[PDB]
Each structure stands twice: as C-alpha cells, then as structure tokens.
Amino acid sequence: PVESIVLQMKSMAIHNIINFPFPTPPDRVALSKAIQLLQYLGALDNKEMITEDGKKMSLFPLSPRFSKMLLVSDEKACLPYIVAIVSALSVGDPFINEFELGGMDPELKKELRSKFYKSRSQFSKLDKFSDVFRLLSVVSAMDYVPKEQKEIFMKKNFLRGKLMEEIVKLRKQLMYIIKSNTSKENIAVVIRNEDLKSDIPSVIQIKLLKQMICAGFVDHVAVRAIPYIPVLATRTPNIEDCFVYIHPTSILNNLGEMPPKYMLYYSLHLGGNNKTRMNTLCDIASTPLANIARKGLLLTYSKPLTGQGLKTVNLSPTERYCYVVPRFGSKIGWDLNPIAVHQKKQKGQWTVIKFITRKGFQTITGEE
Amino acid sequence: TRSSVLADALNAINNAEKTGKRQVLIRPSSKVIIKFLQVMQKHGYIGEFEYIDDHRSGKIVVQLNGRLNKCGVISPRFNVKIGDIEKWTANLLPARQFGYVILTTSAGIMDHEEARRKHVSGKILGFVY
Amino acid sequence: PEEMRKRTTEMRLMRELMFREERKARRLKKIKSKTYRKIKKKELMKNRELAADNEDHDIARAKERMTLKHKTNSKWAKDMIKHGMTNDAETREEMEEMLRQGERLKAK
Amino acid sequence: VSSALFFQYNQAIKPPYQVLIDTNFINFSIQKKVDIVRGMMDCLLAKCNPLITDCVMAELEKLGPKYRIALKLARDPRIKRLSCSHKGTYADDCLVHRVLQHKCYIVATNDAGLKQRIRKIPGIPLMSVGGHAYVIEKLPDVF
RNA sequence: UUUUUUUUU
RNA sequence: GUCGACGUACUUCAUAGGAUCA
Ligand SMILES: [Zn+2]
C-alpha cells in the first residue's frame, strides 16, 4: 500500500490525489486505506489537509506508523528504545530461524535454537510485553558491548550479520534528522536520547512505552484464551469468529503461560494448515487502549450505567461524573471495561472530557 | 394503646444503647421505673439519671456507660414462688451466674439473690444482664 | 439585578432533573418480579467486577464459623427440604446458591 | 499407635476430663442457654476442666463487639487457658494439631467439617450441643 | 504442525 | 351402571452443586 507516498504529496498539499501523473495508475484500495489509516494515525482528517503532526511525520524517513510511534513518543526520555524498535523492524528477518541451516546434527541445530532461545529469554525482563521487547533488548545489548568486539557477541547467540550495521547507520540517520528538525543535542538528560549506542531502559516508563506503541499499531487488536484467538480489531466488522494466531517466526509462538488478553499486532499473513500469522504484538488491557482510542472514531460510548457504587452525579445542569462502558466496534464490535468519565454538554451532546479514576469518583460523589 | 410503661422505658434504653448513644430520654415514669432503675444502677449497668418534672407523668434522662448487654420485662407479671425463682433464672439468662432477675416482693423491688437471702418472693418484673 | 434570573433558571433545571429521576425511580420501585430483579442484579455484579486484605477475609471466616448461618439447619432451608419442595429445581437453585456462598466464606 | 489405645477404646481418657472448646461451642451454648461447666457435668457425670487455646481465644477476640458476651464467658476465671506453640492460625487447625499430638482431650465443637476430620483420628470423643444439652458421641464410658 | 527470494531515505 | 361430587387410604413425578484430573 501507498500510504507514505500520498502522505508526502499531501505534505506538499496536492489535493487531487487521484489525478496525480502516475506512470500507470495504481489501485484505489491502497489510496483509500491511506486516507483512512492516516486519519487514525492522527495525521489526516476529512478536512483534506494533514495535521501539523502529520507534516512532522513527513519530516521523517520511515513508515507512517513508524514515524508516528517515534513522533508521539517524544516524552519522558524513553526515545532510544522507540528508535531501536522503529529501526529494528524496518529491515526483514532480524534473527535467523536456526531451523534451516545444516546428540546428532538436528539435535545440535535444535540446541542452537535452544541457546538462542535462552539468550532471547535472558534479553527480555517484562514477559507480558511483546516480541517487541525481545528486539529492543537485543539492540540494548548489541550497542551496549564494544562494537569492535561485538561480532563474536553477535554470533555467540547466533544472530543476523549486516542489517544491524545498517541499524547503526539508520540510528545515526534518525537522531541526525531529529537534530536537524529540532535542536535536541545540547540538553542534559537527552544524552540518553543522544546516545549513539544503546543502554538499559527504565522500570515504569516501559508500560508507558506500551501505551505510546499502542498509538502506533492502530486497528490491530486481539484477545487470548494451545492458542485460541480471534482478531478484536472490530473496526473491520468481518474479521471475527476466525482462529487467528501469532506468526511462528515470532518468538511469541506459544511461549508457555503468556499472560495478557489484549493483543496488538503489526500485520498478519495466512498459510500452512490455514494458520494465520500475526506478526509483531503489544499487549494491553484496560485504560490505555481507550486513552488512545479516543484519538479518532475508533471508540464511542453508551448511556451511563448504574446500580450501587456506579450512580451518575450531577455537578450542574450541564456537567456530570458518570461511569461509562466504552464501545469500540463501529458495524460488529464490542466493549471495554468502564471508566469514571467526567463530561459536559456542548450544543446538545454530553461530550466526554476527562477520565476520572475510581477514588476520584468516590470523592466527587461524596461531595454531592 | 399504651399499656406497660416500664416496657417502653426498657425498650427505649435498649434501642438507644445498642446504637451507641450516651443519654436517653424516657417519658412517662412511674415509681416502678425509678425503683427498677435504681436496681440496675446499684449493679453498675447504668450511670446516674435524673427525673425532670413537668406537671404531668414526668420524664427521665438516663446516662448510659456501656456495660449493659440486655434488659427487658416479663410481661404477664407471673407469680413466682420460691423454687420458681431458679426455674425463671435458668430460662432467661445466658449463663447461670451473671445477670439478675428482678422481682416485686412484699419487701420491695429487688433482684433474685437479694430475695434469696431475705426469703421472700412475689411477682416478676424483668431482667438485666 | 438580573443574575437572580440566572439563579432561578439554575434552580429550575435542578428541580426538573430531580423530578425526572424521582418519576423513574417510582416506576421502577413498583416492579418486583424476581426474573427482572435477578437480571438487573446479574449484570450489575458483572459491571461491579469489571469496573471497581486477608484480615477482612479472616474476620469474615471467623464470623461464619461462629455463626454457621449458611447450612440447611436454617429456618428457610430446613422448611424447604423437609417438605419436599426443593425437588423443583428453582428452589434448588436458590438453596445451592446459599450453600456455595457459605463455602466461599469458609475458604482460606 | 500409642501404648494406651486399644483397638478403639482409648483408655487414657478418664475422669476428670479435659475438653477443648471450639469457637462455636460458645455460640450455641449462649443460644441454647446451657452452661459450660455444669453442662459438661450434666452429660459426662464427672468433673471437667474446659480448656481454650490461644488460637481460639484470638479468634473470639477477632469476632468483634457484637459478640462480647461470649467473650465474657470465655475469659471466665475457671476456664483454664492452654497456650499453644503456633504461628497463630485458624482455630480448627490448632485443635487438630493438639488432638494428634496428645490424644487425651475430648473435643467440644459444632461445625460438621471439624467433626469429620476429628472422626478420622481413632479414639477422640466428641461432645457437641444439640437440642437442649451436650450430647457426646464416641465415649465408651457413658452410663 | 516455524518456512523470509527481493528491494530503494 | 367399567356413573358424578366428596370423605378416607395409597402411589408416583420432579436432586444435584462446585474444584481438580482425563
Ligand atoms: Zn496454635
């Protein structure tokens, strides 16, 4: 699909995009998906002009989603990590399978896979995260060691050979282009971001990383329950009742007792034994989905709900605090867990404003 | 209508001490309520109390202090002979050596272990424990 | 002044909010029909669990063992059992619900 | 398999007895208005020495102030207080450990579950208030 | 019940 | 009269719930 192309040429603001002098006109479908997705990317609206952050996305040499997940992540110094992901996935096959290169010799092949598996386990500290945190910790250890000696390190755990010298080039390119757009060099703590190499991440900011990468992969959602999984990205209303499944090439191919139950993916493909392959995940549950599902028409609501401990309070005739359940699927979809949303009514609609938590709602219902 | 004034008094004390209040107001107040209360007071179940006087039946205000588990009235004032003292105190007390059955004899209103000593009996009013 | 007229329209809109809520609550108070109340309670417990420490559990277990309130020596249950009335499966639903609630309390 | 026990006689239980009280023996005593010491005299027809364990007294003190009359009954001066070498755990567990470690107490209790778990252990008689008095089950010296 | 040929900042 | 309304006597139908394992 054609989405970064029309992103750049709407950053030049050539409005009649279908009337571009193509060598031969491509399909309407990729352009239409470009329109819609970059509306969910926070880059475009029906207003036919891109956003200011959409123009800032155009200032980045990446995929539109990759540029966004850098762009919004400019918060709380967690930027080297998102650089590591946005440049690690940007070239295919980050790790050799170690399955197709030849006890006995198949046993030693499977033992190479076992030792690389022990490595990849020893890389990631938050199991709940994704296959994302695997490659993140791989980058965080690759440039951790001296790169003069890193080659034996890079083949101790039996990895790929050249695309990460390319990732060092791409990393320097990306921080250079950020330096070029904005003066971010001579700031004190931003040396973490200005690290040409990679060191150890934070402890709580990583769940916020899960938040801001949920902003990236829009409309790619699933659950868990042996895997037994449907795609919960119900903005497409016809992708349900099907057993969808992790990419077996991804190390999250049935990691024993993987906890979580909202499954974010990069992409998917179908094949052998009719098995489906959802590629690069991120795993989230309750609030930060609807924090960054409010960003477009991904999410709407219901009337407020009630009972005891859930009673709507009115601070005014045009202002209230109510528990609400958030709906997510447009024509065929579902609902998240409720939230103490505080809202007002502008021109005849109770327009949601703020996401009050549980204890704040208990105080605000004590007061009246 | 209103029949037992003592039953109303003991029920008002009981309710307004279950819920934790500190002083109770009980209207009307016969001589029997004063003497029943002086019997409860001697044993430490209530604090002092005071009769406020209009020119009518009169009201009382009692000062509670916690130590009261239950109090009540036995409503037909059954005649109690001298062995029936101990059948009565086995029926209406949760452990046969605390709590006092209170009864009206020719020698006054008194608990049962004072009507054992003086060797009297009479009718039966109520109980506290 | 005129800000008084603002005050009156504010108290007006509070009063009519109060009246609409009171009319709704009256009409719902009259509906006692154990399937309707049962449905409302079920989806309430669902929403309570989704939206909204051993010491409270140990006090609750202690009171439950002191009291033994959730076994079939209680007046309602012994009445239903001893008069063959719990073979009908709805009152057996209710009796089993009592018993499992008590078993939740006695768990450690 | 101690030197006292017969097949199931258990002849190290003898007058005067030593009973262990559970927390809902007290509740149904207060409810059916029997009295601890004389009630056990009126069934066993022998002297008694009711004993209460630190785990059980902790449980009574855990109930609260609605049940304060039973606590008043349990701090009575002639109910001895056997102390127990425990972390401080659930009452019924402490009773079962006492019974296994000495096999010379009879157990007064009223919950069915503790009744079953005692009944597995051979030779431990088992008082319980029923109806209007303290019925005893597995004691071969009754009448 | 892994199945990555290929590519441009 | 294989009659009805009762009055006695009796019969029968409705019992499984949770937890773990396969
Ligand atoms: Zn103990």
Side-chain angles (χ1 to χ4, degrees), chain A residues 1 13 21 23 25-26 30 34 42-43 54 61 64 77 80 84 88 92 94 102-103 106 141 146 161 188 201 215-216 222 225 227 230 233 237 248 256 259-260 271-272 285 287-368, chain B, chain C, chain D:
Chain A
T287 174
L289 177 39
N291 277 111
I292 302 99
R294 185 179 57 184
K295 305 292 121 180
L297 193 149
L298 304 94
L299 176 140
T300 47
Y301 306 101
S302 51
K303 287 312 177 208
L305 78 165
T306 177
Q308 54 192 326
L310 309 173
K311 159 185 284 298
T312 174
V313 309
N314 309 67
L315 266 289
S316 290
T318 43
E319 159 152 23
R320 84 198 203 203
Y321 287 74
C322 51
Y323 267 86
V324 176
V325 64
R327 187 179 181 274
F328 191 66
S330 300
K331 310 308 145 45
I332 294 93
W334 49 275
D335 306 330
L336 278 81
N337 309 336
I339 54 172
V341 63
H342 149 77
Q343 55 194 326
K344 297 186 193 147
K345 181 161 50 209
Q346 312 280 70
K347 274 319 188 213
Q349 180 39 259
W350 283 111
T351 295
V352 305
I353 287 296
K354 186 174 178 200
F355 272 38
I356 306 304
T357 180
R358 198 189 76 97
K359 185 67 217 313
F361 186 79
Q362 291 187 358
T363 46
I364 205 72
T365 185
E367 301 319 288
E368 283 79 20
Chain B
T1 44
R2 204 185 290 247
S3 308
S4 174
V5 167
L6 191 152
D8 291 1
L10 283 167
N11 175 235
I13 278 172
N14 217 348
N15 278 2
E17 192 275 349
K18 178 174 73 71
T19 81
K21 263 80 152 186
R22 264 301 311 260
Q23 55 179 0
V24 179
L25 186 146
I26 56 173
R27 159 183 76 95
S29 74
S30 49
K31 279 173 307 195
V32 193
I33 308 195
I34 308 299
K35 303 252 174 188
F36 194 93
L37 279 171
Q38 286 187 327
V39 179
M40 286 161 69
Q41 180 175 1
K42 174 182 283 184
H43 285 308
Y45 296 92
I46 64 166
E48 65 183 1
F49 61 95
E50 150 180 47
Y51 169 98
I52 63 170
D53 185 74
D54 42 358
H55 277 181
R56 293 168 178 88
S57 303
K59 309 174 186 197
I60 302 181
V61 166
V62 192
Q63 313 283 340
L64 308 156
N65 58 351
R67 287 143 65 75
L68 175 70
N69 294 346
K70 207 173 179 290
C71 64
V73 68
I74 291 318
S75 185
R77 283 177 172 129
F78 283 129
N79 319 307
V80 166
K81 291 202 167 75
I82 196 160
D84 301 340
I85 284 179
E86 61 86 19
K87 296 143 76 178
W88 275 104
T89 178
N91 302 353
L92 55 84
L93 296 192
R96 63 167 287 280
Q97 277 282 49
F98 68 80
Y100 285 135
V101 187
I102 282 178
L103 55 85
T104 315
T105 70
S106 312
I109 295 196
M110 48 183 54
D111 42 357
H112 64 275
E113 314 173 1
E114 182 152 85
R116 285 289 221 178
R117 315 209 279 266
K118 314 177 64 146
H119 212 74
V120 293
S121 293
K123 302 207 163 80
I124 189 167
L125 297 169
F127 59 104
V128 293
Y129 60 91
Chain C
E2 203 209 322
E3 62 205 8
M4 316 295 301
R5 191 213 203 166
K6 183 177 51 81
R7 211 212 76 166
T8 65
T9 57
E10 300 301 324
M11 326 314 312
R12 277 191 184 156
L13 294 169
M14 293 296 173
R15 282 258 175 86
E16 301 157 3
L17 188 153
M18 279 192 232
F19 177 59
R20 294 169 213 156
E21 209 278 323
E22 193 199 328
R23 193 138 282 281
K24 185 159 206 203
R26 167 180 301 147
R27 168 179 33 93
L28 276 295
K29 203 79 183 302
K30 291 168 69 175
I31 301 179
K32 61 178 77 174
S33 73
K34 276 158 71 73
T35 43
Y36 186 55
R37 297 315 192 135
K38 156 161 295 198
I39 291 297
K40 268 185 37 161
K41 191 200 177 172
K42 285 172 70 177
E43 57 88 16
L44 176 74
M45 294 267 145
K46 188 55 182 198
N47 293 322
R48 202 94 193 280
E49 174 166 335
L50 270 43
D53 189 359
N54 283 318
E55 265 296 278
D56 174 345
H57 189 93
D58 276 14
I59 298 168
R61 166 174 157 97
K63 291 181 186 176
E64 170 56 48
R65 269 189 66 247
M66 175 72 148
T67 300
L68 311 166
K69 202 179 65 143
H70 288 277
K71 292 181 182 255
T72 47
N73 303 325
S74 71
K75 295 190 192 178
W76 172 66
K78 185 201 288 169
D79 183 52
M80 286 321 194
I81 281 173
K82 266 188 191 158
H83 293 299
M85 262 188 75
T86 177
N87 303 276
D88 176 11
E90 307 202 357
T91 76
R92 195 159 77 258
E93 271 195 29
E94 294 158 21
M95 182 179 72
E96 287 154 3
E97 188 158 294
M98 177 197 50
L99 267 166
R100 304 179 309 182
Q101 166 67 219
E103 200 68 42
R104 267 186 211 83
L105 300 159
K106 279 141 205 159
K108 39 176 78 171
Chain D
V1 60
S2 185
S3 305
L5 186 67
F6 204 57
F7 288 170
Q8 267 194 54
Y9 185 11
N10 183 29
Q11 49 197 351
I13 289 187
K14 58 186 71 175
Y17 303 87
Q18 285 156 333
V19 300
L20 288 149
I21 312 184
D22 187 29
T23 182
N24 46 5
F25 199 67
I26 309 297
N27 182 32
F28 291 96
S29 285
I30 308 307
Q31 183 194 319
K32 309 272 184 37
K33 288 174 201 305
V34 306
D35 178 346
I36 299 292
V37 185
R38 265 173 81 266
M40 298 165 213
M41 201 155 278
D42 273 0
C43 81
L44 301 185
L45 290 174
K47 284 284 186 203
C48 279
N49 289 318
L51 303 188
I52 192 154
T53 44
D54 278 337
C55 305
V56 180
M57 173 82 58
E59 182 145 90
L60 273 296
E61 290 197 318
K62 215 173 288 169
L63 275 299
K66 174 160 173 289
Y67 296 73
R68 65 177 180 174
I69 175 169
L71 181 55
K72 176 72 169 180
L73 273 300
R75 289 219 210 85
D76 187 74
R78 64 201 221 281
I79 289 183
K80 281 130 179 176
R81 194 140 160 288
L82 188 83
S83 164
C84 76
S85 60
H86 291 281
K87 204 192 151 293
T89 44
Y90 313 117
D92 62 357
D93 295 359
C94 196
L95 292 195
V96 177
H97 292 97
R98 297 310 298 231
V99 166
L100 294 175
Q101 299 161 359
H102 272 66
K103 271 216 173 200
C104 73
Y105 308 102
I106 74 170
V107 166
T109 184
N110 224 339
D111 185 292
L114 187 54
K115 288 269 208 65
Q116 317 278 350
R117 297 231 315 280
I118 292 300
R119 277 174 202 156
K120 288 161 182 166
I121 307 146
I124 302 300
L126 190 56
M127 187 182 288
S128 74
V129 64
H132 69 84
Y134 285 162
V135 311
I136 52 171
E137 278 162 59
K138 308 188 140 287
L139 182 63
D141 188 359
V142 175
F143 78 113

